[PDB]
Each structure stands twice: as C-alpha cells, then as structure tokens.
Design a protein around this ligand. Structure first.
Ligand SMILES: C=C/C=C\[C@H](C)[C@H](OC(N)=O)[C@@H](C)[C@H](O)[C@@H](C)C/C(C)=C\[C@H](C)[C@@H](O)[C@@H](C)/C=C\[C@@H](O)C[C@@H]1OC(=O)[C@H](C)[C@@H](O)[C@H]1C
Ligand SMILES: Nc1nc2c(ncn2[C@@H]2O[C@H](COP(=O)(O)OP(=O)(O)OP(=O)(O)O)[C@@H](O)[C@H]2O)c(=O)[nH]1
Ligand SMILES: Nc1ncnc2c1ncn2[C@@H]1O[C@H](COP(=O)(O)OP(=O)(O)CP(=O)(O)O)[C@@H](O)[C@H]1O
Ligand SMILES: Nc1nc2c(ncn2[C@@H]2O[C@H](COP(=O)(O)OP(=O)(O)O)[C@@H](O)[C@H]2O)c(=O)[nH]1
Ligand SMILES: [Ca+2]
Ligand SMILES: [Ca+2]
Ligand SMILES: [Ca+2]
Ligand SMILES: [Mg+2]
Ligand SMILES: [Mg+2]
Ligand SMILES: [Mg+2]
Lengths: 426, 441, 354, 54
C-alpha cells in the first residue's frame, strides 16, 4: 500500500478538492457515505492509495481540509459528498487571510499550522508506506497561497524523504478577485520552486477560455472551471489509482518527468472537450490530436513557443493499444522539433481500461514544456507594474514583511524564466 | 552432480523467473505441488535435474532459487500463484518501496539495507549444496532494482563465493515497452560495476522479442506475459545442458570456456528458431536445414544487429527434438557456401553442437506452437557491440546536459561515477572494434 | 510528411537530392542529429549503421550499403576479386593486380616479382602502375625496382597493376580516356544502370615512350584541367558523352557503343554487385539501404573493356546532375516513401539456365 | 569438415565440427563505498534542514 496524503487549502483549494473527491469516488464506486457499490475489482485494487478503510468496510478519503475562515468548508460539509470526509480532518480558523500571502504565511496561518500538522501526522502514522503528499490550492489568494506554501515547507522539514505534489491554480487578470494576486503568486512560486517535486500549473484564464470558446459556455462560473480541473486531476492521477506499469507512483513519475530539479512545473490537458454531437463516438486519432492541441491545455501557454522536455500521456477506456501506440508515435514523428532531442524517448504513454463516468474514452496530457516560462513572465510583468510604484505593499508590510523579500521573490522568478530559456535553446 | 542457484532480481527478473520455473516443471514432469512421479529416489538424489531442484523427504522438488524485489507486489504473485507450493517463504524477499527506476537508489540507498538479508537467504541454499557451481542471475538493465541492486549483489557474491561462476540473463531496454527515460543511465552504470563479476551474460533486447512476437506470433500488442514465455523458451534451451544428460556445456565453467575466450567480451548473441503461432491452423514443419539457416537471420536474434559486419569468436548450436548429426553437418556445409561467416584469425572456424532428442515443451494454452525440432544458437560475435553503441549514444545525449543526474547524486552517488562508467563502456566498444574490424570521385 | 537528415554537406549529388525532396513539399528536413527520420543521407566515413532501424514506427532508409567499401577501395577490390570464386584469380576483365604493403609495415610482393620476371624474360610488355586510395599520387614504370621503392617512401597500402599499354585512342588527338558509369542499387537490390555515361578524355596525345609526363596517361578531370594545355580543345571540359562516342564508334570502327562496349560494362557491373550481395543485402534487415556507385572502365584497342575501379561516393557530370538526381528520388526513395517515362535506368538482370 | 568428440547418450548427443583451423573489491572496500554514499545523503539532508531552520 503506497498511501498518498491529500491536503486542500483555502477557498479555491477546497472547492476544487471537493469536486475532485466527488469525481474519483464515483470512479472507485464509493458512495457519499463511504460505502462501496462498484462492480469491478479494478476499483478496489489500489483504493488504499487515496482512501483509508474504516469499520464496516467504509472507505474514508485520506484528506485534510484547511482554511483560515469556516465558510467554504461549511459548504463542503453541506455539499454532495461532504459527509464522506473524516470530521477531525477539517482544520480551520475564523479570521480569514484577506487575500494576503503574508497573513497566510506569517501571521494568521502561523497560528493555525501546527494543528494542521497534527492531523497530517495522524494520517501519515497509519500509512504502511507513505508516498508523499498532494496539495490543491490557488496561488492568488492568501490561505491556499501563503498558508499552503507554509504547510509545504513544514511538511518537507518533517518528511524530507517524501514526494510533494501540488495542483496550483495560477491567477489571471481576466478571472481575478483582487489586484494583489500577482504579489501572492510571485511569493508562492519561489516556495514551489524549492519545495515541490511536481506542480501542475492550472491557469484560470485557460480554463475560462476553454469554457467560453470550446465548450460554448456563455458565462462560465467558478463551478464550471472546477469541473474542468476535477476531470483533469482525475486523469492525471489515473496511473496512481489503478493497476499499471508507467508512472505508477509519485517518485517514479518525478524521475521520468523532471530532468532538472527546479523545472518541475507541468502543463496538463484533457480530451475530449465537447460542447452540448456530444454522443458522437471519439476515435483514438481524434483523442490524440485534441490532447496535444494547445486549446485543450490549461496553462495558457503556447507549446509551439517552446520545447517538451518530457511528456506523459494517459488514455482511458476500451481502445486499441496498437492504435494508441501508432497515434502517439505519429505525433512525435510529425512534430519532432518540439521535443528536445537530447532526452531520447521522452514521451511515455499509459493506458487504463476504466474511462471517466459517462465517456467511452478520454485522454489526459502532462507536459514538461519550456513554454511554461510564458506563464511566469506574465506574472512577473504584472508584479513589476505594481512593485515599481510599491502599490498595495502596505497590506504586506503591515504583517511584518519588508520590501527586500518582494525584491528577492521577483529575482527568483526571473531566474526561473531564464533557466527555461536556456534549455529551449539547448 | 553440481548445484546451480538461480537469483531473480526486480520485476523483470522475477517475472521471467516465474516463466522459466514453470517451463522447467513442465519439462521435468514436476507438478505444481512439487511432486515428481518419475523420480524414483524419494527425498534425495544426484540426477541432472537435481542441479536446479532439491528434494524434501516428502518428495517435494524445490527450485534452487531466490527471488528479490524492493517492492512486494510482483513477488506476491509468486506467493499466490500456480506454483506457490513450490517455494517456501525464505526464498522470496521483498522490501516496502522500490528503487524508483534509479540505479543509485537500488545500489546505495536501499541495497545497503537489504543486501545482508539476501546473502543470508542465498547462504541457506548454498548450505544444501554438496558442490555448488555458481549462480544464474536474472534482471533488467533498466529498472532501479534490476540495475542497482544486482550490481551490488554481484560484487558481494564475488567476495563470498570467489571460485563460483556467475552467469547473467539481462533484459536490455526498449522504448516500446519501457517505463523510464533514464534506463540508458541505469544500463551503463550496472554494466560498468558488474562487468568484472560476470563470467558470461546473455542479453535479451525487449525490442527483438517484441518484434518476434508481433511478426511470428501475430500478437498485435505483446504483453510481458507473451514476452516472458518466449524468453523462457530461450533460457530453457540455454540451461537444458545443465539439467539433462549430455556432454556439452554440462557445467557453468564450460559456458565461459566454449563461448568467452576474452573475459570482458562475455556477451554471446542468442538466436532462436522456429517461433510458430499456436493459432496457425496449417503449419508445415521446418527441417533441420531451415531452422539452422534461420539462426543467421537478424530477425530471429535476441538482439537486432548484423553479424555479417563483425567477427565470430565462438559458435554453439543447441538443438531440441528430432535431429541427428548427419543433418546438422549437411545444413552447415550449405550455409557456409551461402552466408557471410568470418571467425577471428586466432579461433577455429567451427561449431560445437548439442542435441537433446526431447522437442521443446510449450505452456498449455500458450502462444507458441509445438514443433518437431528447434534450435538455439549461441555465438560470440562482435556485432553485438551495436547494442552498446546504441546505449552509449543515448547516455551521451542526456549526460551532456546532466539531465536527471540530480536524482542519482541525491541518493549519494557521485557525478564522477557517471563518467567512470561511460569511460569503461568506451573501452568496451574499442575492445570489440579491435577484435572485430581490420569523396568527390 | 516524410522526414530526412543530411550528414554529408560536401556531396553535390545529395545536395541536389535534398533540394528536390524539399521541392516535393512532402519531405521535411530535420537537424542532422534528430533520430526521428525516415531517410538518412549519411556521412562518407564511420556512418553509424548500428543506430539505424531502432525507431519504433519509422521505416528507415540510408543512402549507403554497409560493406560496399570492399568494392570501393583499391586494395579491397583486388582482394575481393582474387578470393571470390564468382570472380576468381583468372577473371578476364580486371587487370593483373597485386596488393603491396610498404616494407615499413597478406603481401604479394614476391608473387608480383615472379609474374614480373616472367614477362621480362619473354620479351612481353612490362609496364605496371602503382596507385592507392590515399591519393588525390601515381607512378607508372617498366622497372619493378622503381615501383616497389616508390611505395616504401609512402606509409599506406598500395596496388601494383598491369598498365594497359594498348588503349583505345580517340581521333583526332590520339588520346586516352576512361568511361564512368553510374549505378544505383535500391533496397530490393535491383541494379540500375544510368543510361547516360561519360568519357573522361585526355586532351594530350598518348605517348608510350614517356610515362614520366603523366597528363597523357591519367584521364582524371582534375589533372587534365590543371596540367594539360589543351583542356577543352576537343570537347567541353574533356567530357565526351555517349551519343558522340557512339557516333564515333560507328563512323570510325563500324560498330556501336552497345555492342562493342556496353554489353561488357553491364556484365562487369552485375558480376561485381551480385558477388557481394549476400554480404551487404538489407532484404531482411531492420533498416534498408540504397547506394549510388561510380564504375570506372578502360577500353583497349581490341574493344575489350577493363574495370579500373568502383567509387562509393561519386560526383556526376554537371549536365547530368538534374536527370540522375531525379532518378535517384524516383527509384531509390519514393519507392520506399511514395509521394501523394521511359525510365532513365537500365535494370541489369539475367537468368541463364545451366 | 571434421566431426570430433562425438558423445552419445539416450537423451541425445553432442559433437564438434571444424570447417577450418585458426592462424576484486574486498568486503571492506564495498562497505566504505556504501557508507560514503550514505554520508553524502546525510550531509545533503543536514544542509536542507539547516536551510529550513533559517
Ligand atoms: C459542457 C460540456 C458538458 C458535457 C460534454 C457534452 C462532455 O460530455 C460528454 N458526455 O461527452 C464533457 C466530457 C465535456 O467535454 C467536459 C469539458 C465537461 C466538463 C468536465 C466540465 C464542464 C466545464 C462543466 O460545466 C460540467 C459541469 C459539465 C459536465 C460534466 O458533468 C461532464 C462530465 O464530467 C466529468 O467529470 C467526467 C469527465 C464525465 O463524466 C463528463 C461526462
Ligand atoms: N521482458 C520483460 N521485461 C520487463 C519485465 N518487467 C519489466 N521489464 C523491463 O524492465 C525495465 C524496467 O525494470 P523493472 O525490472 O521493471 O524495474 P525493477 O528492477 O523492479 O526496479 P524498480 O522498480 O526501479 O525498483 C523496462 O525496460 C521494462 O520493459 C518483464 O516481465 N519482462
Ligand atoms: N591499369 C591501368 N592501365 C591504364 N591506365 C590506368 C590504369 N589504372 C589507372 N589508369 C589511369 O589512371 C587514372 C586514375 O586511375 P584510378 O581510377 O585507379 O585512380 P583514381 O580513383 O584516382 C581516378 P578515378 O577513380 O576517378 O577513375 C584512370 O582514369 C586511368 O586513365
Ligand atoms: N478555478 C478556481 N479558481 C478560484 C476559485 N476560487 C478562487 N479562485 C481563484 O483563486 C484566487 C483567489 O484565492 P482564494 O483561494 O479565493 O483565496 P484563499 O481562500 O485565501 O486561498 C484567484 O486567482 C481566483 O481567481 C475556484 O473555485 N476555482
Ligand atoms: Ca490571531
Ligand atoms: Ca530423487
Ligand atoms: Ca569472479
Ligand atoms: Mg476567495
Ligand atoms: Mg520494480
Ligand atoms: Mg577514385
């Protein structure tokens, strides 16, 4: 049993995390009360990766829910699968973090973090063989961003030999709550550069544009964005949750995907993306082409603007593996220039027989592309436009931060951008 | 009679091991419960099959084998499988978390903690042997355990069993079925540290087996199960001489004597024919001349390469089934007049031939058809160096950028071990070239 | 979209082939170190054949046959002919030749002298020629001593060959020549003789009393354009093509190029390539080969054709680049990688029963 | 084409045909290597914990 411990923090983190557990619970045949009602042994074979077994053959998510205000976790608890979570794994304060990284990381978050670590330890202690951790959060707010990265640092201190994986929602001016999001995101990215092994970068503008342009949703909601993210998270974790050879655990995945320690930020993608023709059969060739289509990717970065260091592709459903191999080989052989030539055979493909609910087949894309630098450049530009005038800084210096820490975060992310550029030219 | 101990390391080693022991039981008339009706000496004996099987007082025939893996799920198959009664718990060794496709993790970090347990279990087997010959070691190049723990184990076996022969069966990495981008690193690191500890190694390229299964068994997308059943057939041909009455390759020492005049150059090429589909409704049976001629086709080799552009140091033909010497010599004469077969000047141009009258055994309900006669050719040809060139090129591509190197250094390995290993391979390639080889116009 | 890589920038023939491939709009050129190619236009030396044919989902083709060097090296060709039963030491279209290693290094010195001495005693013509692949470097002499000593002053393998004292001389000019034939062997080992050949002529009158001045003895295009005053006097660039040569043969000797010479050329080409087919064929191999060869012939005054050598990386005559290069694409490349006449080649084949 | 050393038994036979004639680290050292690597992991981990302490 290679247990993963899941953590979800702040508003974004808990809303997406709740949807994620809804989605994979349905895949494993777990109902809202933790009872199993599936019809396939494939569903239970690796169920212990994400679920603990309670008395009465109940399955309980190995999940810790964290926030600095009670509202979103109240909603989670009142939601569809809200009763499936362990009540003691709800850890929350009352004062909130005010969309402020400093409040999350240094003041409000600091008061709460030990109680979170106590629950993390309790979950880790019962693991037969802990793989590591996966955190869901946004980078643009205060709790997920500031307290989330505080958590990651303390977890690394207590579990230095375990893998740390995040699903990190990057802010965009187009789908924005506050003007200080670029401050919060820049502060957090430096934390992630040092303390995660794998980070899936989800850009809210990409999510919005997929909903509006491709799915024809006239007025996308956070709820719509979150179902996209949930479907993607289900796809990217398929290899962890079902029998398989490739990327079957967090460490083997990292060894395959991360050739240089700092360059561990992935662009995920999902297919099919279909507007409400929705009954039309999908072919492997069509899955493959859409999976690699920039329009199906979620970092708002143009892959043709860079090069792939490594790629993992996961196909789900009953389909010809012969055709999958053929189609995957075709994509690499016909656009070979976008794959760095100094990492031979850097595209790995996995197939899982169980498709997502309500689909005959689907495909999920994980790319380690140097084009991700565009995302960090955007954040850096927005950061500097304000910081050059020290605008909105008083929210942070009021929590004890000084300007030098912002200067260092800025330099750190520009270093990261430079590091991507050198391998794009290599 | 002198005993041989088989050691199966990591997923590839273990699963190939389970395929081989299954086939051995079928060949020797041993049931899944270990009983062997044809063995009239209950509870002991020194027959040729006793080289691979010991005997309990209850008449159980138990493989002289240890299975080792750093994660438990593959060996849990063996504990749980058809031949579970064959083995006792002390023969199966598992850790809790694997080497993550990382040679350094397998060799240094985890290997350090499990190596003494493994040697203890091996010692227990050796204490049952009146005259231990040495070891047959099965593993992948590409896995962290298959690469890293095997090289550690091989070093310690040279220390604890200095006079004993060690043969390898090694799975060379193929991207069509591979699970890690770093397998070229692992392959070259393990080859470097194992080189001086191995007397003879049979490399099997997954690419070759994969393509034989697709082409000759009509399997669209071969599984490890398909691959391993074919690999076990070749392994069985190679070890049959140790397990049956005969006068060729009857002990491990003879493998080196017959196939390896140059110690570092200890990688014979295996070629096997015929491979026929069991679903093939109508099959014309192949003659001694036809299966022998097939031994000189790259399409039938365990490693794709071109022996026409290399030189032979030694050649062994191992037949199973309806074959007499007269027909072998007639086939060889013809083949020499048609094929490119150059031996090095300091070796004789000839063939050592073994015939076992019992035709190949096939797993009931398997992919392979029963045939009247089959042959495995073992030739030490410099052409196999093509596989080292391929591997070394991929290694160079990644190492020039230090891609993935931090994973290894992070486990305590020094970066210098990379260049040291690669320098050793460069010399190996040069050795093959010295043995093998002599615009605007 | 098919893909290819270029690894010999110095090749005119394949610069043009590359040019054509791109012009189809259906071929893409990759960086020379990208492994995901359909087609490799390889380097002349140490081409990595061992890395070919291991790319899942890519049929791979290269423009050289591994092992063809046996035919395309001076010393290797001599050895191949003497030791191959299909060719033999009594082969009639190859001049009496010997491999000689400089004494600062088997070696046929004594066998050469014995044959040399026999001629000297029987009043026979005894002019031999020393040459080697390591040249741009040639010595013609009727004295064995000069021949053997000239080779010792060098450090590479050499060939001493009987010099054809009775060449066919073109008129006017009384001049020597050699015939170049271009031959394309595809992946199926079809042997294709390009219909157009070229006569590389000497613009100096042949002189058997002076082998010291080599311009009238060596027909090489480079040598003629450098050391011969009358370059281009009789024909443009000292190149006469088959139409004119045929018209000459009719006019002067009442015969045809096909009858007097080409029959022998085709015989020799097929004999050479069929001899090494088992050694180099890629029929059941994991990658495939084709190669363009340049055969060089001499004709004596009895209209007997002699093979001089085979070139593994030939250039073409300027006027013929476009046609032959298109021919390469059509039969050697598009045959394997079809795109979305009256062939220019003669397929050499013959199945006599006995 | 000479056959030599023909051996026959009930289970088969073997022979040789000639077409033409011719013309370690000690336990101590392994230990030191494994302990040296372990030491380097410890140093790297110690450095990380120092960084996190700061
Ligand atoms: C807006 C499109 C909704 C449905 C489409 C017709 C498609 O459905 C089918 N059956 O083909 C789906 C796959 C779309 O392509 C997806 C982009 C929809 C998507 C994930 C998110 C939208 C943004 C969001 O509004 C959401 C509330 C709408 C529909 C989801 O209930 C669809 C299901 O969600 C899943 O998690 C599984 C993959 C699978 O069961 C899927 C059928
Ligand atoms: N032929 C064959 N190859 C296998 C098998 N299992 C794995 N491989 C190959 O072995 C390589 C991966 O090594 P594994 O043996 O799975 O790794 P391991 O030795 O268990 O090491 P870790 O899992 O890294 O601790 C890849 O090249 C696989 O294609 C098998 O059953 N048969
Ligand atoms: N045995 C021989 N008898 C008469 N002339 C000869 C000869 N060998 C060579 N020659 C002359 O010398 C020239 C060059 O000889 P050779 O072909 O062996 O060397 P090379 O490779 O440098 C020139 P090329 O290959 O382009 O023909 C020939 O064109 C021919 O005219
Ligand atoms: N995709 C998605 N993004 C969200 C959601 N809620 C907030 N965000 C984004 O998250 C950032 C705000 O952080 P939030 O999680 O609300 O702050 P926190 O509660 O302090 O962590 C902004 O970039 C918002 O666009 C959500 O439910 N889904
Ligand atoms: Ca407080
Ligand atoms: Ca017995
Ligand atoms: Ca030894
Ligand atoms: Mg909010
Ligand atoms: Mg394993
Ligand atoms: Mg030449």
């Amino acid at each position: 049993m290679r247990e993963i411990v899941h953590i979800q923090a702040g508003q974004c983190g808990n809303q997406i995390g709740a949807k994620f557990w809804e989605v994979i619970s349905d895949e494993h045949g777990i109902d809202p009360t933790g009872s199993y009602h599936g019809d396939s042994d494939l569903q239970l074979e690796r169920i212990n990766v994400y679920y603990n077994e309670a008395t009465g053959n109940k399955y309980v998510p190995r999940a810790i829910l964290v926030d600095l205000e009670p509202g979103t976790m109240d909603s989670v608890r009142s939601g569809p699968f809200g009763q499936i979570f362990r009540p003691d794994n709800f850890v929350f304060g009352q004062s909130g973090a005010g969309n402020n990284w400093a409040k999350g990381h240094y003041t409000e978050g600091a008061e709460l973090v030990d109680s979170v670590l106590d629950v993390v330890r309790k979950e880790s202690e019962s693991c037969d063989c802990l793989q590591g951790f996966q955190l869901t959060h946004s980078l643009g707010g205060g709790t997920g961003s500031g307290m989330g990265t505080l958590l990651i640092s303390k977890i690394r201190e207590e579990y230095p030999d375990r893998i740390m994986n995040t699903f990190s929602v990057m802010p965009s001016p187009k789908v924005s709550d506050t003007v200080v999001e670029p401050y919060n995101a820049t502060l957090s990215v430096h934390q992630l550069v040092e303390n995660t092994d794998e980070t899936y970068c989800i850009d809210n503008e990409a999510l919005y544009d997929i909903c509006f342009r491709t799915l024809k949703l006239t007025t996308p909601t956070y709820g719509d964005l979150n179902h996209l993210v949930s479907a993607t998270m289900s796809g990217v974790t398929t290899c962890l949750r079902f029998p398989g050879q490739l990327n079957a655990d967090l460490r083997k995945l990292a060894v395959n995907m991360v050739p240089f320690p700092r360059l561990h930020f992935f662009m995920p993608g999902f297919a099919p993306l279909t507007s409400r023709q929705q009954y039309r059969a999908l072919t492997v060739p069509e899955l493959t082409q859409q999976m690699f289509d920039s329009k199906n990717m979620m970092a708002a970065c143009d892959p043709r603007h860079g090069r792939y260091l490594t790629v993992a592709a996961i196909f789900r459903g009953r389909m010809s593996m012969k055709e999958v191999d053929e189609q995957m080989l075709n994509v690499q052989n016909k656009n070979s220039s976008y794959f760095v030539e100094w990492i031979p055979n850097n595209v790995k493909t996995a197939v899982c027989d169980i498709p997502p609910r309500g689909l005959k087949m689907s495909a999920t894309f994980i790319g380690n592309s140097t084009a991700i630098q565009e995302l960090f450049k955007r954040i850096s530009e927005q950061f500097t436009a304000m910081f050059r005038r020290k605008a909105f800084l008083h929210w942070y210096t009021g929590e004890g931060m000084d300007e030098m820490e912002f200067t260092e975060a800025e330099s750190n992310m520009n270093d990261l951008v430079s590091e991507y550029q050198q391998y794009q030219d290599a | 009679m002198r005993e041989c101990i088989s050691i199966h390391v990591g997923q590839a080693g273990v699963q190939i091991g389970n395929a081989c022991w299954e086939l051995y039981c079928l060949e020797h008339g041993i049931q899944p419960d270990g009983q062997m009706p044809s063995d009239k000496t209950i509870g002991g004996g020194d027959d040729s099959f006793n080289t691979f099987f010991s005997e309990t007082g209850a008449g159980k025939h138990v493989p002289r084998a240890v299975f080792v893996d750093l994660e438990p799920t593959v060996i849990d198959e063996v504990r749980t499988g058809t031949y579970r009664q064959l083995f006792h718990p002390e023969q199966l060794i598992t850790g809790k978390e694997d080497a993550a496709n990382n040679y350094a993790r397998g060799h240094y970090t985890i290997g350090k903690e499990i190596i003494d347990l493994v040697l203890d279990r091996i010692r227990k087997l050796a204490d049952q042997c009146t005259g231990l010959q040495g070891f047959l070691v099965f593993h992948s190049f590409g896995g962290g355990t298959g690469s890293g723990f095997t090289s550690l184990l091989m070093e310690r076996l040279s220390v604890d069993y200095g006079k004993k022969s060690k043969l390898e069966f090694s799975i060379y990495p193929a991207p069509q079925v591979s699970t890690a981008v770093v397998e070229p690193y692992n392959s070259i690191l393990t080859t470097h540290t194992t080189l001086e500890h191995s007397d003879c190694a049979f490399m099997v390229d997954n690419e070759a087996i994969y393509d034989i299964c697709r082409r000759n068994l009509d399997i669209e997308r071969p599984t490890y199960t398909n691959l391993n059943r074919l690999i076990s057939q070749i392994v069985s041909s190679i070890t049959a001489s140790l397990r049956f009455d005969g006068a060729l390759n009857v002990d491990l020492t003879e493998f080196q004597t017959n196939l390896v005049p140059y110690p570092r150059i200890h990688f014979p090429l295996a070629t096997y024919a015929p491979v026929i589909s069991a679903e093939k409704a109508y099959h014309e049976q192949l003659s001694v001349a036809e299966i022998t001629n097939a031994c000189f086709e790259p399409a039938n080799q365990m490693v794709k390469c071109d022996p026409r552009h290399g030189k032979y140091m030694a050649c062994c033909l191992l037949y199973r089934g309806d074959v007499v010497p007269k027909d072998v010599n007639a086939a060889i004469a013809t083949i020499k007049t048609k094929r490119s077969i150059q031996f090095v000047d300091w070796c004789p141009t000839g063939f050592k031939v073994g015939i076992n009258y019992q035709p190949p055994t096939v797993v009931p309900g398997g992919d392979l058809a029963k045939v009247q006669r089959a042959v495995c050719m073992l030739s030490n040809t410099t052409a196999i160096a093509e596989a080292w060139a391929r591997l070394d090129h991929k290694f160079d591509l990644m190492y020039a950028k230090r891609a993935f190197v931090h994973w290894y250094v992070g486990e305590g390995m020094e970066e210098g071990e990379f260049s040291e290993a690669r320098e050793d391979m460069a010399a190996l390639e040069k050795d093959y070239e010295e043995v093998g080889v002599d615009g605007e116009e | 979209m098919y893909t290819f890589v270029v690894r010999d920038e110095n090749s005119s023939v394949y610069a043009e082939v590359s040019r054509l491939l791109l012009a189809t709009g259906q071929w893409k050129r990759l960086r020379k170190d990208n492994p995901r190619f359909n087609l490799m236009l390889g380097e002349r030396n140490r081409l990595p054949f061992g890395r070919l044919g291991h790319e899942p989902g890519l049929v791979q083709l290269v423009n050289y046959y591994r092992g063809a060097d046996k035919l395309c090296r001076k010393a290797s060709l001599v050895k191949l002919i003497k030791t191959s039963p299909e060719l033999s030491e009594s082969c009639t279209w190859f001049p009496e030749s010997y491999v000689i290693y400089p004494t600062n290094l088997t070696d046929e010195r004594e066998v050469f002298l014995a044959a040399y001495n026999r001629r000297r005693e029987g009043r026979e013509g005894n002019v031999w020629i020393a040459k080697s692949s390591a040249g741009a470097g040639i010595l013609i002499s009727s004295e064995a001593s000069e021949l053997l000593d000239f080779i010792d002053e060098q450090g590479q393998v050499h060939v001493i060959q009987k010099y054809l004292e009775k060449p066919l001389l073109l008129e006017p000019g009384h001049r020597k020549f050699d015939i170049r034939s271009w031959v394309l062997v595809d992946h199926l080992y079809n042997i294709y003789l390009y219909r157009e050949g070229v006569l590389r002529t000497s613009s100096e009158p042949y002189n058997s009393a002076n082998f010291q001045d080599k311009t009238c003895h060596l027909t090489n295009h480079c040598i003629q354009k450098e050391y011969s005053k009358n370059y281009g006097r009789y024909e443009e660039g000292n190149e006469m093509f088959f139409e004119e040569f045929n018209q000459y043969l009719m006019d002067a000797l009442n015969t045809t190029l096909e009858n007097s010479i080409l029959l022998q050329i085709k015989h020799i080409i097929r004999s050479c390539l069929m001899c090494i087919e088992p050694a180099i064929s890629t029929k059941h191999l994991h990658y495939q080969s084709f190669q363009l060869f340049g055969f060089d012939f001499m004709v004596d005054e009895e209209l007997k054709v002699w093979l001089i050598e085979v070139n593994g990386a030939p250039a073409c005559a300027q006027k013929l680049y476009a046609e032959l290069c298109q021919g390469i694409v059509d039969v050697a490349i598009s045959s394997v990688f079809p795109l979305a006449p009256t062939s220019i080649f003669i397929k050499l084949h013959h199945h006599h029963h006995h | 084409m000479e056959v030599i050393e023909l051996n026959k038994c009930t289970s088969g036979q073997s022979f040789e045909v000639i077409l033409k004639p011719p013309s370690d680290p000690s336990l101590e050292e392994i230990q030191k290597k494994l302990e040296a690597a372990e030491e380097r992991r410890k140093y790297q981990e110690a450095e990380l914990l120092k960084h996190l302490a700061e």
